[PDB]
Amino acid sequence: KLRGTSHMKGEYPFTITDHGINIFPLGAMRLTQRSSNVRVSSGVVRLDEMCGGGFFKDSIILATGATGTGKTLL
Amino acid sequence: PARIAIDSLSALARGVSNNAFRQFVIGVTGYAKQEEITGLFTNTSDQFMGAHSIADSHISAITDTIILLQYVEIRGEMSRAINVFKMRGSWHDKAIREFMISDKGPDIKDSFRNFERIISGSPTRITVDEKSELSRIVRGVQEKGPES
Amino acid sequence: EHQAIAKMRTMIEGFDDISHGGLPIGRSTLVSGTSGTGKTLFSIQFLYNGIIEFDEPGVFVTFEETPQDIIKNARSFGWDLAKLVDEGKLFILDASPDPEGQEVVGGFDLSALIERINYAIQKYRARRVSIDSVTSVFQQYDASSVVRRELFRLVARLKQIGATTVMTTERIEEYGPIARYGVEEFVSDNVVILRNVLEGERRRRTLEILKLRGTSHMKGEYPFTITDHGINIFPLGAMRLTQRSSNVRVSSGVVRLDEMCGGGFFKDSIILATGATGTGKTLLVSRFVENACANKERAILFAYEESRAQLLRNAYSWGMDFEEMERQNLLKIVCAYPESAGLEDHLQIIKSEINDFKPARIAIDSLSALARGVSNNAFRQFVIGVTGYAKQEEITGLFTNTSDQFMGAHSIADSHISAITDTIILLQYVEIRGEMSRAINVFKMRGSWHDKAIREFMISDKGPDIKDSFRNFERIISGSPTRITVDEKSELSRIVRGVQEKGPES
Amino acid sequence: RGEMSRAINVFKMRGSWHDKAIREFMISDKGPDIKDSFRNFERIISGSPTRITVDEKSE
Ligand SMILES: Nc1ncnc2c1ncn2[C@@H]1O[C@H](COP(=O)(O)OP(=O)(O)OP(=O)(O)O)[C@@H](O)[C@H]1O
Ligand SMILES: Nc1ncnc2c1ncn2[C@@H]1O[C@H](COP(=O)(O)OP(=O)(O)OP(=O)(O)O)[C@@H](O)[C@H]1O
Ligand SMILES: Nc1ncnc2c1ncn2[C@@H]1O[C@H](COP(=O)(O)OP(=O)(O)OP(=O)(O)O)[C@@H](O)[C@H]1O
Ligand SMILES: [Mg+2]
Ligand SMILES: [Mg+2]
């Protein structure tokens, strides 16, 4: 509590490093990520094709498969 | 960095609860998103052949591009296959291609067009009179054209 | 009103409903709660509202907080208690200890207080009294039996004096005894319990009226938030089932679809979009919202998965310029991580944004995004909330949902937000010849006829093109069908040989 | 054919290339004798195959 004003509620993880307390307000981060149309290769040309021109620079890529399929290769 | 890659988010999902995990995923996913950084995240689905779900953890919503590898039983053999499942901004190829792995890396080949139930891991070969109709002996209506 | 006891309104949004009318006059209400739950605020709002709305002078007895502080803090919600103390409508009776005091004084002061209070009530002709932290006074050195007596005496004199009182109390456990000395519960005429439940690192405040001697009231806990305007309660269970229902159709932003629904969606109707990840619910959402702006109607888009940038990069790539929809003050995009708060907060934000923009179309991209973490009932309560507020607001709405499993999903929603929905739009991936094609299906529509086929649909730069159904296929829904054929080559336009033209001419 | 026969398979090798065939193998007093692949079967992995016995192209 903070009689008089507002404040984020609940718990928030923090670490004590060689630079003191370090808190991450994972619930404070806003949904304002910049997004462009710029591409970027994958290292696999055929892939880049199937993705219609490569992975966007601004994007998260997830590779899912059974053990041994080859995610670590891509 | 301009690019980042964490091999196996699924390796970090060990022990930890699911929401604690999803919180981790939101963390290194957005931090990367705002920093402009391109990241490739890895996930080993708990079950080979039959996987009814992209991620057991259900993070396939906080992601933009999903790449899918999967074994395909072909004539007593374990062949791979690759499929760009979803891409939010581009068009991407809808084919479930097969692919080998050599010293050179990954050679993406073709799709198994003459099969059924490929996503299962144990397709069903089914040419049995391909795209040529039972009229492969073209009936015989063509017995008038050539004469003496 | 068929209740046996006269009540006074708190004018606190949502409380008067829960208590079927406000607080019983001439009686006393125990608002007890742990630390930082909103006790002072409730009691302060209780007097303020009584002054601002009914010209009822109020008395505020404070035992720990300083009169300057009570005034400094209330400015948090824009209240000038000073101007009121001044106009002589509000009188703060300071009974706090001295920063340089002694020890011993909690009984004759209980008689001196009674008399002090009576004096203030008589002087200011007060109708409402708040007593903040009565507990702190016996917190000098007392036991349950002494407390019961002193509380009773105080309360009993107040009743006689005619005053309608509110008394604050503390507690250490969120679910254990109501108040500290397990005696306050029984001496009060009414009991309101304020909680701040932890549960999975989040905080959820609730308000519950435990008892009201004389009338009934809503039972159980109720979620609420403290904002710049004080307490704000949501009686999610007082939400009746009397929404107006029109036969008015509206477009979905997709021509073929509207046909499929027998002529567009109903204005008054909740729409559900579900399919596997990547199927394209988010496209129909973009198309749904853009059409509200193509007819010069406002529309909000609460996004819980895509940033404000991406939503626009992707939207543009499908045609439709979101940049303009925003400028013409016709389309409003929100955006937020479900994690950035609790459902309560989220549901309010939504409610708010709906008032400050009078939409005619709302879209919540990914209910299942909000589904993250939250228990299933806490989620359904939310779904009842958003789906309800909208239905009674004539606001048409499109809700999205991502089924945890691509191909093979045996149910619409893993959550059962089915019966809560009027129209259901089901997308899925069909496995045909080594490739992943799409398949859209108008699963259900309550007042309409809607098309029964599971069509195939392509996603281009243009948008969603709804083709035809895989007639000659079985086990469709399975995800990977079996091609059986009684035909295929059957007419439609056989005529072999040279049928096409090529780029040159035709 | 109403018989419990085995099959061994090199599922994955991080370095090398390894074989991609599901091979039938027997056990005797000599040890493991890895035979051939059920090339003409389906759903081997499943465990209850189904021989295709495809009628060729049928001429
Ligand atoms: N030189 C090589 N030649 C042919 N195939 C190879 C070669 N190296 C590795 N492989 C094949 O690729 C696979 C390696 O998998 P990889 O290292 O790409 O990561 P993964 O499947 O994503 O994850 P994990 O290794 O934890 O199972 C092996 O299972 C094997 O079949
Ligand atoms: N403008 C505001 N916006 C949002 N929250 C506020 C605002 N002002 C105060 N709050 C919140 O309300 C709380 C104040 O509690 P309040 O002073 O009403 O009494 P209490 O918590 O019941 O009892 P105590 O005297 O032990 O603190 C703070 O903990 C804070 O989180
Ligand atoms: N410009 C485009 N051209 C062709 N296809 C596109 C284009 N943009 C998106 N797509 C297709 O649409 C899909 C995007 O999905 P969409 O944004 O409609 O929401 P969703 O699938 O319902 O949910 P989520 O995006 O969270 O997975 C991609 O998987 C892709 O196949
Ligand atoms: Mg690996
Ligand atoms: Mg989406």
Side-chain angles (χ1 to χ4, degrees):
Chain A
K1 83 175 165 172
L2 282 196
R3 295 178 185 169
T5 39
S6 58
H7 62 91
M8 295 179 72
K9 281 65 174 176
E11 304 185 64
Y12 295 99
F14 76 74
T15 355
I16 294 181
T17 69
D18 284 311
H19 296 309
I21 295 174
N22 203 71
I23 316 157
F24 313 89
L26 297 183
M29 176 179 57
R30 296 179 181 180
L31 210 50
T32 313
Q33 344 281 58
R34 293 167 296 152
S35 176
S36 78
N37 240 283
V38 163
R39 300 272 180 179
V40 195
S41 199
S42 56
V44 186
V45 191
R46 197 76 193 67
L47 218 200
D48 278 80
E49 293 182 52
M50 297 170 75
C51 290
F55 304 158
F56 292 84
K57 168 178 169 294
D58 292 322
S59 75
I60 297 305
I61 328 299
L62 162 73
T64 345
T67 184
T69 54
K71 294 96 65 186
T72 310
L73 173 63
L74 300 194
Chain B
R3 285 189 193 186
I4 262 177
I6 298 179
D7 202 341
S8 197
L9 290 172
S10 51
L12 285 168
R14 304 181 195 172
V16 186
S17 77
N18 181 285
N19 283 321
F21 183 64
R22 263 177 166 175
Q23 203 188 74
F24 178 78
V25 180
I26 306 301
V28 187
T29 247
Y31 182 65
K33 264 189 147 192
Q34 61 173 55
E35 223 59 50
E36 281 296 76
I37 312 186
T38 309
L40 184 67
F41 299 96
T42 295
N43 188 53
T44 301
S45 63
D46 271 309
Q47 62 183 70
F48 74 91
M49 303 174 46
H52 271 301
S53 55
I54 284 69
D56 296 289
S57 14
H58 317 307
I59 321 280
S60 39
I62 287 69
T63 216
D64 307 305
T65 304
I66 291 179
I67 287 302
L68 187 41
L69 307 173
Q70 57 137 298
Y71 294 116
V72 185
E73 182 193 308
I74 292 302
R75 297 150 171 164
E77 288 196 66
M78 294 282 81
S79 60
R80 289 70 186 310
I82 201 173
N83 168 56
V84 167
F85 209 63
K86 84 161 187 183
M87 260 216 90
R88 289 172 166 169
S90 167
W91 143 91
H92 89 71
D93 180 35
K94 322 294 183 175
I96 301 169
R97 303 192 167 297
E98 119 162 281
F99 78 79
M100 55 123 252
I101 293 183
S102 59
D103 311 285
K104 307 181 179 185
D107 173 60
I108 299 177
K109 290 164 272 189
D110 284 303
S111 57
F112 315 78
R113 184 190 317 84
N114 43 315
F115 288 61
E116 273 186 343
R117 304 204 217 80
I118 272 141
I119 298 302
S120 61
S122 280
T124 287
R125 341 176 178 182
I126 44 62
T127 69
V128 179
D129 215 336
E130 286 156 49
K131 216 29 171 96
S132 65
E133 308 192 326
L134 172 47
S135 62
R136 83 95 188 189
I137 46 285
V138 210
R139 304 326 310 166
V141 296
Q142 165 48 231
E143 202 43 52
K144 294 73 176 186
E147 11 53 43
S148 173
Chain C
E1 198 54 85
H2 204 45
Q3 298 182 295
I5 317 297
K7 298 182 180 177
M8 175 182 56
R9 296 143 75 201
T10 55
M11 287 303 298
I12 290 180
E13 209 231 50
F15 185 89
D16 300 318
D17 277 290
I18 300 182
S19 58
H20 293 9
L23 306 175
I25 294 63
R27 293 185 163 170
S28 53
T29 294
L30 194 81
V31 183
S32 150
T34 56
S35 187
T37 71
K39 295 169 279 174
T40 313
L41 176 59
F42 189 85
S43 59
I44 288 298
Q45 217 168 325
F46 173 57
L47 294 179
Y48 182 64
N49 288 11
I51 290 177
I52 304 300
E53 289 261 27
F54 312 94
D55 193 36
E56 309 186 324
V59 179
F60 187 83
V61 190
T62 167
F63 286 104
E64 223 135 58
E65 268 172 69
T66 253
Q68 343 317 299
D69 296 302
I70 273 106
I71 296 182
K72 183 63 156 182
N73 300 331
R75 289 179 196 289
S76 193
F77 324 94
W79 304 327
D80 183 0
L81 300 172
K83 176 180 163 195
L84 301 179
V85 167
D86 225 60
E87 311 186 331
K89 302 286 209 184
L90 169 75
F91 170 65
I92 302 184
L93 176 63
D94 172 25
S96 65
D98 191 50
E100 309 186 65
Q102 55 158 302
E103 208 297 290
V104 178
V105 58
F108 239 6
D109 65 350
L110 212 293
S111 287
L113 181 58
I114 296 296
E115 280 184 50
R116 277 205 70 184
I117 295 171
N118 189 57
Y119 174 87
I121 293 167
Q122 271 188 54
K123 189 185 185 173
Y124 298 84
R125 288 172 282 162
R127 296 318 258 66
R128 300 178 184 206
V129 182
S130 287
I131 298 176
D132 210 345
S133 64
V134 308
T135 286
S136 59
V137 82
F138 335 93
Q139 268 288 291
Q140 291 192 308
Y141 45 42
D142 299 84
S144 71
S145 58
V146 196
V147 177
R148 190 164 198 161
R149 246 183 299 107
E150 304 297 348
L151 281 182
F152 181 86
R153 176 191 290 176
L154 171 44
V155 169
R157 287 282 291 92
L158 285 168
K159 179 170 282 176
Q160 304 179 314
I161 303 300
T164 307
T165 339
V166 168
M167 277 170 40
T168 273
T169 286
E170 25 214 69
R171 3 140 57 202
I172 0 283
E173 225 302 89
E174 224 63 68
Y175 286 105
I178 274 50
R180 272 180 187 291
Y181 309 78
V183 168
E184 308 75 323
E185 295 96 282
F186 316 88
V187 177
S188 309
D189 282 285
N190 322 296
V191 172
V192 180
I193 303 165
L194 297 181
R195 276 174 252 257
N196 198 177
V197 190
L198 194 21
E199 158 223 283
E201 308 194 322
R202 288 307 72 179
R203 277 286 181 186
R204 166 167 205 174
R205 13 182 55 118
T206 68
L207 169 148
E208 144 154 73
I209 296 178
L210 225 213
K211 88 163 170 188
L212 281 184
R213 285 173 175 160
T215 61
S216 75
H217 59 68
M218 290 178 77
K219 273 85 173 182
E221 288 176 78
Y222 288 111
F224 87 80
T225 312
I226 303 188
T227 65
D228 281 337
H229 297 313
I231 298 178
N232 201 82
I233 316 168
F234 313 95
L236 312 180
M239 189 172 86
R240 294 178 167 182
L241 195 66
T242 310
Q243 352 266 59
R244 293 169 283 173
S245 184
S246 76
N247 269 296
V248 179
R249 300 291 192 122
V250 210
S251 191
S252 52
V254 189
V255 203
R256 197 84 187 66
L257 224 180
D258 288 289
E259 283 175 44
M260 291 179 78
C261 289
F265 307 154
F266 279 110
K267 177 175 164 301
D268 295 331
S269 89
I270 306 285
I271 313 297
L272 180 65
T274 339
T277 185
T279 54
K281 294 89 61 191
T282 302
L283 174 42
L284 291 162
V285 169
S286 298
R287 207 74 153 194
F288 178 66
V289 136
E290 167 221 61
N291 182 290
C293 307
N295 278 299
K296 299 189 177 182
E297 298 170 300
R298 286 189 173 174
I300 307 182
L301 163 53
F302 305 78
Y304 300 85
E305 300 185 301
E306 303 191 69
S307 80
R308 342 210 182 190
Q310 204 181 311
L311 274 175
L312 262 138
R313 178 200 68 185
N314 302 348
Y316 194 86
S317 299
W318 280 313
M320 52 209 302
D321 180 301
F322 275 1
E323 269 289 61
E324 200 68 58
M325 321 269 87
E326 301 200 74
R327 304 163 191 164
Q328 287 170 275
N329 257 71
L330 289 182
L331 168 277
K332 186 175 185 179
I333 302 178
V334 177
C335 284
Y337 282 97
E339 297 58 42
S340 65
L343 287 24
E344 57 178 8
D345 302 288
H346 286 297
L347 198 238
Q348 198 193 84
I349 304 289
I350 293 191
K351 289 195 172 179
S352 164
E353 220 85 1
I354 297 178
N355 296 323
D356 311 316
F357 205 67
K358 55 76 175 175
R361 285 195 173 199
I362 233 165
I364 301 181
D365 209 336
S366 194
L367 279 168
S368 74
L370 298 171
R372 301 181 212 167
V374 171
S375 43
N376 200 304
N377 298 312
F379 174 73
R380 247 171 183 176
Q381 206 184 81
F382 186 82
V383 169
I384 303 300
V386 189
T387 294
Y389 180 57
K391 269 190 144 177
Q392 70 157 57
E393 227 46 49
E394 300 283 60
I395 298 177
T396 314
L398 189 68
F399 302 74
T400 272
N401 184 57
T402 290
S403 73
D404 268 320
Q405 74 179 79
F406 68 100
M407 315 167 51
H410 270 301
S411 41
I412 275 61
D414 302 296
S415 50
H416 322 325
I417 292 313
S418 246
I420 290 75
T421 190
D422 302 299
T423 288
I424 301 172
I425 304 300
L426 154 54
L427 301 178
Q428 57 150 305
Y429 291 127
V430 172
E431 182 194 304
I432 308 304
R433 299 153 157 171
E435 290 175 65
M436 311 266 78
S437 64
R438 282 93 205 301
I440 177 174
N441 172 70
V442 168
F443 204 58
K444 84 148 183 173
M445 275 210 86
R446 286 171 164 170
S448 156
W449 144 86
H450 90 80
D451 189 37
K452 315 301 175 184
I454 314 164
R455 301 181 176 294
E456 143 157 279
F457 77 89
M458 50 122 283
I459 300 178
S460 68
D461 321 294
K462 297 190 177 182
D465 183 46
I466 294 181
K467 287 157 282 189
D468 310 302
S469 68
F470 313 63
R471 184 182 317 86
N472 51 301
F473 282 77
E474 289 167 349
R475 292 179 61 244
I476 288 294
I477 321 298
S478 84
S480 51
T482 289
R483 8 287 199 184
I484 87 87
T485 46
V486 46
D487 66 315
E488 94 85 8
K489 158 61 183 176
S490 61
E491 29 93 76
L492 267 48
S493 73
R494 327 98 168 188
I495 286 53
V496 204
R497 290 294 177 144
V499 179
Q500 269 311 80
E501 28 66 291
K502 173 95 291 184
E505 216 168 71
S506 58
Chain D
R1 291 157 189 159
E3 273 193 57
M4 299 289 98
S5 61
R6 295 73 179 306
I8 189 171
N9 175 61
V10 183
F11 204 59
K12 88 151 184 187
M13 263 212 108
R14 281 172 166 167
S16 185
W17 143 99
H18 82 67
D19 200 320
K20 311 300 170 175
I22 302 178
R23 300 179 174 294
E24 132 154 284
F25 76 86
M26 74 92 230
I27 300 184
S28 59
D29 320 293
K30 300 182 175 187
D33 178 64
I34 309 178
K35 285 158 272 188
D36 308 311
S37 87
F38 308 74
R39 189 197 311 89
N40 43 313
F41 283 101
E42 208 153 297
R43 297 180 188 162
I44 297 165
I45 274 300
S46 109
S48 273
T50 297
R51 190 169 39 242
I52 61 132
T53 68
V54 136
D55 309 65
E56 350 154 50
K57 52 263 185 296
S58 199
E59 270 45 44

